Symmetry: D3
Subunit: 96 residues, 6 copies
């Protein structure tokens, strides 16, 4: 609910973090379009649809491309530190 950036630490035993990302087309930012039930993201209970990913393990994804967001997530290791900012209006305005 907070519009202030949040730090969320997710742990994974396999590649999946439990969410799907969109954006990164032309510097509009990377957003979480949906959370998968039972996965790390779901279990934490902090990440949601509409969240924008500011960074993943220090790597700045604000003006990142989808390909970069994907690479950052892929190499985040088992403990993934996501800084997300809940901004639905923008998500809608840009994707829905």
């Amino acid at each position: 609910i907070t519009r202030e950036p949040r730090k969320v630490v997710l742990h994974r035993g396999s590649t999946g973090l439990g969410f799907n990302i969109v954006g990164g087309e032309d510097g509009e930012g990377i957003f979480i379009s949906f959370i998968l039930a039972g996965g790390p993201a779901d279990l934490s209970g902090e990440l949601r649809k509409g969240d924008r990913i500011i960074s993943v393990n220090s790597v700045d994804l604000r003006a990142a491309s989808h390909e970069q967001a994907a690479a950052a997530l892929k190499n985040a290791g088992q403990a993934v530190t996501i800084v997300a900012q809940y901004r639905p209006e923008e998500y809608s305005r840009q994707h829905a």
Copy 2:
């Protein structure tokens, strides 16, 4: 490599299918933007980045919205039948 629709059956024991989807913004179609290592999609070896999802278990996703694509995948059960069509040019043209 084939541009003809392919039927791909993925099996899952948890919510994840092993890929990330984009599109579904304004009827441009749903595409696989990236495959996750070790997941069902990766293991099958048929699905790839650039693939467009024509349908998931009969449900037509050609002109579906991201929200619908997500719901179809969510309720596909354990055996998910995807009909994908490899069209990179369009993926680029529309997302990259």
Copy 3:
């Protein structure tokens, strides 16, 4: 919703089937007390809280003890064929 026995086939890559069982104390039957999100049971969408397990791979669990129900499930292999019968009244009447 049907009170007639249903055959449900769940597939697992690990020990978990995605549900929790109670009963088997004094021949009252084995019941599913809760479904876990993302697991096989959840994904199938057929099994629910209140369901009574008639059998698991031919093994009759009607008048089974909790210990037997556990052993049947443990050795069901990867393809587990459950015959469940939805009877909430009895579940309540006996456990809640």
Copy 4:
């Protein structure tokens, strides 16, 4: 073997903790009826059949109902702190 409460921290990447719970019918307490091979509970090696769950992440489950025990576990996040007390006699006396 100790009858003194033990703190056990289990980590999960999916909903499952690796054990099955019974009780919570009429304030007799929540007990672990069986451990699943390969799951978090099994891997830790501390939790066993006969253990009574005093609490899960501060939430007191002593006189909890099965429904509450289930909700506590469901929302425990990825790091689940269980305080269990090994009391087989009571488990038998009440369930077996």
Copy 5:
């Protein structure tokens, strides 16, 4: 127990099959040195320590090198058809 080749079909949602392999050094054959609890191999209940892998999805591994055995398993897809032959004497004679 049978010394006659057996066909065993394992299903996986992730890379792991649930067993560890040795051999393939100098054409002595590939053997299963240990089974992991809860994994596909364990769940099937057919594969055991001492088993020699004749083939994996038609690919003949009799005189295969460890590197080839690894590649065959890696690309077996989700349904892996193993033809194993239980020969402990040889396993000992060659590895233990």
Copy 6:
């Protein structure tokens, strides 16, 4: 790349660590023959083929037998502390 021992902490929610081990035949040491995609080992990005396992949670595996290496790994719990030393020459010299 470093030939100096490295401490690598892997986390698992199931029995699998994400790698396959060989050796332990006649005190030549235990080595990682291959890494599985998506598993803990792969995700960490530190362990590789050719690595020799000096210890797993203090348990010295230098002159361990395959059976001991297997037992150490089996009981390492969820947080597994591996001290590996990258020595390919020896791996080749002894296995390939």
